[PDB]
């Protein structure tokens, strides 16, 4: 006849981790708080350090006969809040107003992470039968680099998963596929000369312009001819540019950066080879070269929409949730590089339009419901 966890404690756990400011860093403080919570309920977590102050957390709960392993994953970092004067309620105070809990990370994705942790604790304390293991993977640095996702995958912590749920904000939809993301830089080298006597020089901006023209044309042809049923066309934009030093000097340096959102139908390897081909063609017959660097490279993700994991989730509802795709990347771009296939979906509490915006909040009834829904999902999938 053990006591239940009170509603006020469930809400307080989420408030406490929102108050921990973990902007591109300080995830070790979030991990320590959650590990201490798990220890109060006789679950022993494993801290896996990324760098000083930045720790991943793994935890496991097993019951019954050796069965499947279901992973539950979320990240502990949040994006910057920006000008705090612009917020109605302070971004790291975790204030409650009505059904809304306000704070940076309330929706992306500390509500999902807290709901997963509490679901595991309540699953254990309910005594309800299943046959398998549920594994928490709480990661460092998802927003800039997917640092912990990559670390844990390379280390081997994904190797035993049969299925994985990522708790990003989807509200009541199931995201089973999302685009890749590439950021790239092209640098152009030229030779200075006075603008009145230019034959002594080589115009670095002109050479860079030729790259933009050809890359836009080739990427537009790719968008016109190839597409994904859910995710759409490949996206390409040059987003930053600089060059030159004085209006009457031929520019000896120029640079741009761009962003691409990719689809499985024309994968990242092929996109990078295409950009490299354009650079090679434009460098023919000159010693003043363009150079390509890839700064970010996350692959697209596509799971089986009819997997046993998705069936277990739909069994919790009178009417099926919509299956959807999304443009943004997740830690699944690193976890799916594990050397085996597993069922996958993104499903978590939160307001889909509010990640990374001012006055971010989560609905408290959505958060509390998802604590219950995750337990039902686990019991179905690991039956």
CA distances from 277 to 149, 191, 356 (A): 31, 24, 36
Residues that bind Zn ion (CB under 5 A): 108-109, 168
Among 43, 212, 294, 358, binds its own copies (CB under 8 A): 212
Looking at beta carbons only, is 205 or 279 nearer to its own copies? 205
- Asked if 179 is part of the footprint of its own copies (rule: CB under 8 A), the reply reads yes
112 binds, among its own copies, Zn ion, none (CB under 5 to 8 A by kind): none
CB neighbours of residue 8 within 10 Å: 8
The half-sphere exposure of 380 on its side-chain side, counting CA atoms within 13 A, is 16
Among 25, 67, 145, 244, binds its own copies (CB under 8 A): 244
Q: How far is the CB of 287 from Zn ion (least distance, A)?
A: 35
Q: State the helix-helix crossing angle for 364-381 and 111-126, rounded to 10 degrees.
A: 50
d(CA 20, CA 30): 7
Catalytic annotation present for 108:
no
Q: In this structure, what DSSP letter does residue 191 have?
A: B
Looking at beta carbons only, is 272 or 328 nearer to its own copies? 328
Output the DSSP codes for 76-96: --B-----GGG-SS-TTT--E
The residue range among 45-53, 104-112, 208-216, 286-294 that interacts with its own copies, by the rule CB under 8 A, is 208-216
The residue range among 33-41, 111-119, 199-207, 344-352 that interacts with its own copies, by the rule CB under 8 A, is 199-207
Looking at beta carbons only, is 93 or 240 nearer to its own copies? 240
Which residue among the candidates 27, 122, 142, 360 is catalytic per the annotation?
142
| Contact of 75 with 142, CB cutoff 8 Å | yes
What length is written for the chain? 383
3 state SS of 55: strand
- Residue 132: exposure state from Cβ atoms within 10 A (0-12, 13-18, ≥19): buried
d(CA 262, CA 297): 10
Site for its own copies in 314-353 (CB under 8 A): 327-328
Looking at beta carbons only, is 9 or 224 nearer to its own copies? 224
Which residue among the candidates 27, 77, 192, 363 is catalytic per the annotation?
77
Among 242, 276, 280, 341, binds its own copies (CB under 8 A): 242
**What residues form DSSP beta bridges with 136?**
59, 72
Catalytic annotation present for 142:
yes
The residue range among 61-69, 133-141, 195-203, 338-346 that interacts with its own copies, by the rule CB under 8 A, is 195-203
d(CA 327, CA 184): 18
Site string for its own copies, 253-292 (x = CB under 8 A): -x-xxxx-x-------------------------------
Q: Which residues bind its own copies (CB under 8 A)?
A: 179, 181, 183, 195-198, 203, 205-206, 209, 212-213, 216, 235, 237-251, 254, 256-259, 261, 295, 327-328
User: Catalytic amino acids?
Assistant: 77, 142
């Amino acid at each position: 006849h053990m006591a239940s966890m009170k509603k006020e404690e469930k809400i307080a756990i989420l408030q406490e981790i929102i108050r921990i400011k973990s902007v591109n860093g300080n995830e070790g403080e979030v991990a320590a708080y959650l590990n201490k919570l798990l220890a109060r309920h006789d679950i022993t977590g494993e801290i896996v350090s990324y760098r000083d102050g930045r720790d991943n957390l793994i935890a496991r709960y097993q019951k019954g006969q050796s069965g499947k392993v279901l992973g539950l994953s979320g990240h502990m970092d949040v994006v910057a809040a920006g000008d705090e004067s612009s917020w109605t309620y302070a971004p790291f105070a975790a204030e409650i107003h009505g059904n809304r809990l306000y704070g940076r990370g309330a929706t992306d994705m500390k509500s999902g992470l807290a709901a997963m942790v509490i679901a595991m604790i309540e699953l254990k304390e309910s005594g309800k039968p299943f046959n398998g293991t549920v594994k928490l993977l709480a990661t460092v640095g998802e927003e800039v680099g997917e640092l912990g996702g990559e670390q844990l995958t390379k280390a081997g912590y994904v190797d035993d998963l049969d299925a994985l749920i990522i708790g990003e904000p989807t509200n009541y939809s199931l995201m089973y596929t999302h685009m890749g993301s590439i950021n790239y830089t092209v640098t152009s080298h030229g030779k200075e000369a006075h603008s009145s006597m230019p034959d002594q020089g080589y115009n670095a901006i002109n050479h860079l312009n030729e790259f933009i023209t050809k890359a836009n044309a080739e990427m537009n042809h790719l968008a016109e001819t190839i597409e994904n049923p859910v995710l759409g066309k490949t996206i390409h934009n040059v987003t930053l540019i600089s060059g030159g030093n004085q209006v009457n000097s031929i520019p000896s340096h120029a640079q741009l950066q761009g962003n691409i959102r990719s689809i499985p139908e024309y994968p990242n390897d092929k996109i990078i080879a295409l950009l490299q081909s354009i650079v090679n063609e434009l460098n023919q017959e000159t010693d003043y070269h363009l150079e390509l660097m890839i700064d970010y490279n996350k692959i697209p993700v596509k799971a089986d929409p009819d997997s046993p994991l998705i069936h277990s989730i739909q069994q919790q509802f009178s009417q099926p949730l919509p299956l959807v795709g999304a443009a943004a990347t997740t830690d699944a771009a690193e976890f799916t590089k594990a050397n085996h296939s597993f069922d996958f979906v993104v499903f978590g509490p939160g307001v889909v339009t509010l990640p990374h915006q001012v006055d971010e909040y989560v609905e408290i009834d959505n958060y509390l419901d998802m604590i219950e829904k995750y337990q039902g999902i686990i019991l179905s999938y690991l039956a």
